[PDB]
């Protein structure tokens, strides 16, 4: 009778066609990954264009249901999930546009190739190329090179491009009822309409903040330390008082600094924590680790995984006949479809990406009872969150030790502990600054704060200050260098690392309180409890179903994001660094760059 | 239904037995295993009741 209850029966009609209209674009989507052939992309194609054309048909035909009569929170939530136009709000050609310039831009980021001047026939792509050589190739000037030829054959095309695509995200967010499309993207975190729960969309920009300028006494010292080693290692490229060179930070973008660990160890002569070695010694392989995972998740209360994944989820590499992306991703295909394809291997890497992997098919399996719409999580940073706190515990020694992997003689010493800890460092907080000057950044060009005269010479100002990262080579406003990096070339959000890092920080600590453990957090593991699962699963079952500040609160008792189990986790290695940084200096200077002498 | 389907989703055959005892004499019942019929020896019996 009610606008409400048509609303909800409507729900009800869509709900029903798209779990069967997803369920086989999904067995599309895994037989194509599985085996990469011509009919795979056509019926990948077949299905992608049904699905598009049924969500959009759907979004139509909820537009016209009016949200504020609509008392069910449920209802209300589904509809605005499925009444977002999104880009559709502009015009046919305006949107044509947009699409086709996220097009050409994410073309040119995967086939961004730059020629040596040496021999212009021979030309390297970002992957495998160029990211090894800023990974592995220690040379000063082969970094420079590549990393200065990548920004200027892709940041140049890209600029033009790149600002046509803000421009167009910016207008289509304005028709959207937003400032600017950083303001659509922030749309993702707000809540609205529950008391003590609700969140704006500044609200994540001034919680990202606050926790970055917590983070910052912490930052300093790792990058006074990391610029110390490196001095130790080029000590006339790198300034003790100025910002870290660009493309000397082991990537192309300096977002992950853990490729300098091996220049930065703390105690290079203190043998690394893996058990590679063992599971060859066990003959372990991608069905032992699995099952190991699927046993250590019986142990902390889960229930027990479905056989049908065994029977649909590869493990291994399938063979050599069919081509199959062999990078770990967990698939929730819908009607009870839950499988995992990545190509296994012996190595602790493995291991930790597959439990990451059959952690994330859990919490999808968890809120698996909720209608079609609220199987996700309550947010972008919800489900990898969960996925790396499952494999920091599966990376425990405890756990190690408990399995046989580890073996009991193995000595755990604050040396070994302090490497583990700078590692973990490089890998998490290493990023942490980059993400929040690229995503600050992002949302100042979306809102128009930067003008482009000054894009690259403002960029750049932010690397130096927010990161303490000066370029190597000045860069003008026809290099696009934020767009060098995959996300802003391919419209991604990028805080959701950030949200993600505080949130699993977050989640491990509540973990570890409901598990009292005993010692450093970094030493905390969930093994043989209970309790900890089940708390877990109490939220992990709502999904989105309820607001992720609601979730949040339920798990660590605080409805805002913080880093404070950032801190507890490094509490160690903060002290390390600062006592080692007694004679390094602390910080950056903005003025001092490697092509200013 | 489809043989990659999900646990969940698989078929069953599923059969409802509803045993209604109205006034209608009873019909259907155990088999009442007929025991071994001994014989010139004090035995208790029931033979149809």
């Given at each position: 009778?009610?606008?409400?209850?048509?609303?909800?029966?409507?729900?009800?009609?869509?709900?029903?066609?798209?779990?069967?209209?997803?369920?086989?674009?999904?067995?599309?989507?895994?037989?194509?990954?599985?085996?990469?052939?011509?009919?795979?992309?056509?019926?990948?194609?077949?299905?992608?264009?049904?699905?598009?054309?049924?969500?959009?048909?759907?979004?139509?035909?909820?537009?016209?249901?009016?949200?504020?009569?609509?008392?069910?929170?449920?209802?209300?939530?589904?509809?605005?999930?499925?009444?977002?136009?999104?880009?559709?709000?502009?015009?046919?050609?305006?949107?044509?546009?947009?699409?086709?310039?996220?097009?050409?831009?994410?073309?040119?980021?995967?086939?961004?190739?730059?020629?040596?001047?040496?021999?212009?026939?021979?030309?390297?792509?970002?992957?495998?190329?160029?990211?090894?050589?800023?990974?592995?190739?220690?040379?000063?000037?082969?970094?420079?090179?590549?990393?200065?030829?990548?920004?200027?054959?892709?940041?140049?095309?890209?600029?033009?491009?790149?600002?046509?695509?803000?421009?167009?995200?910016?207008?289509?967010?304005?028709?959207?009822?937003?400032?600017?499309?950083?303001?659509?993207?922030?749309?993702?975190?707000?809540?609205?309409?529950?008391?003590?729960?609700?969140?704006?969309?500044?609200?994540?920009?001034?919680?990202?903040?606050?926790?970055?300028?917590?983070?910052?006494?912490?930052?300093?010292?790792?990058?006074?330390?990391?610029?110390?080693?490196?001095?130790?290692?080029?000590?006339?490229?790198?300034?003790?008082?100025?910002?870290?060179?660009?493309?000397?930070?082991?990537?192309?973008?300096?977002?992950?600094?853990?490729?300098?660990?091996?220049?930065?160890?703390?105690?290079?002569?203190?043998?690394?924590?893996?058990?590679?070695?063992?599971?060859?010694?066990?003959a372990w392989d991608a069905q032992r680790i699995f099952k190991e995972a699927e046993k250590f998740f019986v142990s902390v209360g889960l229930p027990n995984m479905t056989q049908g994944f065994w029977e649909n989820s590869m493990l291994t590499d399938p063979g050599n006949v069919q081509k199959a992306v062999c990078h770990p991703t967990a698939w929730d295909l819908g009607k009870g479809d839950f499988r995992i394809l990545m190509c296994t291997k012996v190595t602790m890497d493995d291991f930790l990406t597959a439990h990451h992997e059959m952690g994330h098919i859990q919490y999808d399996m968890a809120y698996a009872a909720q209608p079609f719409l609220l199987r996700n999580g309550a947010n972008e940073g919800f489900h990898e969150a969960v996925g790396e706190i499952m494999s920091l515990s599966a990376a425990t020694p405890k756990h190690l030790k408990s399995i046989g992997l580890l073996s009991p003689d193995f000595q755990e010493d604050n040396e070994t502990e302090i490497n583990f800890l700078l590692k973990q460092?490089?890998?998490?907080?290493?990023?942490?600054?980059?993400?929040?000057?690229?995503?600050?950044?992002?949302?100042?060009?979306?809102?128009?704060?930067?003008?482009?005269?000054?894009?690259?010479?403002?960029?750049?100002?932010?690397?130096?200050?927010?990161?303490?990262?000066?370029?190597?080579?000045?860069?003008?406003?026809?290099?696009?260098?934020?767009?060098?990096?995959?996300?802003?070339?391919?419209?991604?959000?990028?805080?959701?690392?950030?949200?993600?890092?505080?949130?699993?920080?977050?989640?491990?600590?509540?973990?570890?309180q409901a598990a009292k453990h005993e010692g450093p957090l970094h030493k905390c593991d969930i093994s043989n409890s209970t309790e900890a699962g089940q708390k877990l699963f109490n939220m992990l079952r709502l999904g989105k179903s309820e607001p992720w500040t609601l979730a949040l609160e339920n798990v660590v008792g605080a409805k805002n994001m913080n880093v404070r189990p950032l801190l507890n986790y490094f509490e160690p290695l903060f002290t390390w660094l600062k006592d080692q940084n007694k004679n390094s200096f602390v910080g950056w200077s903005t003025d001092w760059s490697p092509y200013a002498d | 239904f489809q043989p990659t389907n999900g646990v969940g989703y698989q078929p069953y055959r599923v059969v409802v037995l509803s045993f209604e005892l109205l006034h209608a004499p009873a019909t259907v019942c155990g088999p009442k295993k007929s025991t071994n019929l001994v014989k010139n020896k004090c035995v208790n019996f029931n033979f149809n009741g």
């Amino acid at each position: 009778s009610t606008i409400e209850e048509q609303a909800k029966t409507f729900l009800d009609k869509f709900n029903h066609e798209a779990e069967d209209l997803f369920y086989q674009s999904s067995l599309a989507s895994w037989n194509y990954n599985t085996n990469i052939t011509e009919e795979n992309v056509q019926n990948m194609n077949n299905a992608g264009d049904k699905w598009s054309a049924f969500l959009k048909e759907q979004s139509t035909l909820a537009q016209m249901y009016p949200l504020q009569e609509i008392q069910n929170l449920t209802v209300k939530l589904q509809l605005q999930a499925l009444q977002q136009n999104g880009s559709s709000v502009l015009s046919e050609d305006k949107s044509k546009r947009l699409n086709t310039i996220l097009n050409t831009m994410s073309t040119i980021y995967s086939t961004g190739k730059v020629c040596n001047p040496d021999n212009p026939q021979e030309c390297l792509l970002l992957e495998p190329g160029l990211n090894e050589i800023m990974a592995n190739s220690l040379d000063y000037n082969e970094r420079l090179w590549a990393w200065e030829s990548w920004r200027s054959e892709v940041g140049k095309q890209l600029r033009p491009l790149y600002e046509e695509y803000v421009v167009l995200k910016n207008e289509m967010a304005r028709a959207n009822h937003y400032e600017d499309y950083g303001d659509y993207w922030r749309g993702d975190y707000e809540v609205n309409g529950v008391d003590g729960y609700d969140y704006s969309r500044g609200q994540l920009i001034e919680d990202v903040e606050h926790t970055f300028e917590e983070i910052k006494p912490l930052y300093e010292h790792l990058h006074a330390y990391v610029r110390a080693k490196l001095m130790n290692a080029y000590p006339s490229y790198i300034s003790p008082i100025g910002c870290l060179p660009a493309h000397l930070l082991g990537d192309m973008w300096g977002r992950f600094w853990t490729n300098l660990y091996s220049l930065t160890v703390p105690f290079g002569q203190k043998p690394n924590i893996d058990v590679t070695d063992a599971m060859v010694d066990q003959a372990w392989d991608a069905q032992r680790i699995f099952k190991e995972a699927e046993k250590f998740f019986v142990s902390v209360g889960l229930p027990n995984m479905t056989q049908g994944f065994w029977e649909n989820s590869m493990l291994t590499d399938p063979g050599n006949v069919q081509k199959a992306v062999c990078h770990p991703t967990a698939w929730d295909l819908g009607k009870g479809d839950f499988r995992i394809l990545m190509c296994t291997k012996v190595t602790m890497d493995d291991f930790l990406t597959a439990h990451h992997e059959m952690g994330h098919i859990q919490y999808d399996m968890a809120y698996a009872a909720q209608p079609f719409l609220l199987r996700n999580g309550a947010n972008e940073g919800f489900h990898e969150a969960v996925g790396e706190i499952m494999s920091l515990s599966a990376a425990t020694p405890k756990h190690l030790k408990s399995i046989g992997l580890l073996s009991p003689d193995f000595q755990e010493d604050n040396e070994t502990e302090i490497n583990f800890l700078l590692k973990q460092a490089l890998t998490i907080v290493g990023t942490l600054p980059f993400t929040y000057m690229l995503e600050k950044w992002r949302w100042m060009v979306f809102k128009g704060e930067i003008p482009k005269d000054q894009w690259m010479k403002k960029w750049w100002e932010m690397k130096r200050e927010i990161v303490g990262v000066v370029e190597p080579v000045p860069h003008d406003e026809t290099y696009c260098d934020p767009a060098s990096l995959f996300h802003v070339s391919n419209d991604y959000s990028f805080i959701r690392y950030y949200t993600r890092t505080l949130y699993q920080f977050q989640f491990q600590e509540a973990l570890c309180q409901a598990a009292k453990h005993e010692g450093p957090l970094h030493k905390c593991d969930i093994s043989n409890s209970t309790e900890a699962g089940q708390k877990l699963f109490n939220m992990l079952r709502l999904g989105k179903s309820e607001p992720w500040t609601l979730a949040l609160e339920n798990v660590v008792g605080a409805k805002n994001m913080n880093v404070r189990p950032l801190l507890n986790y490094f509490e160690p290695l903060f002290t390390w660094l600062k006592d080692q940084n007694k004679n390094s200096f602390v910080g950056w200077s903005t003025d001092w760059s490697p092509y200013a002498d | 239904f489809q043989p990659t389907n999900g646990v969940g989703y698989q078929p069953y055959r599923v059969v409802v037995l509803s045993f209604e005892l109205l006034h209608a004499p009873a019909t259907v019942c155990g088999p009442k295993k007929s025991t071994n019929l001994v014989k010139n020896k004090c035995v208790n019996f029931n033979f149809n009741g």
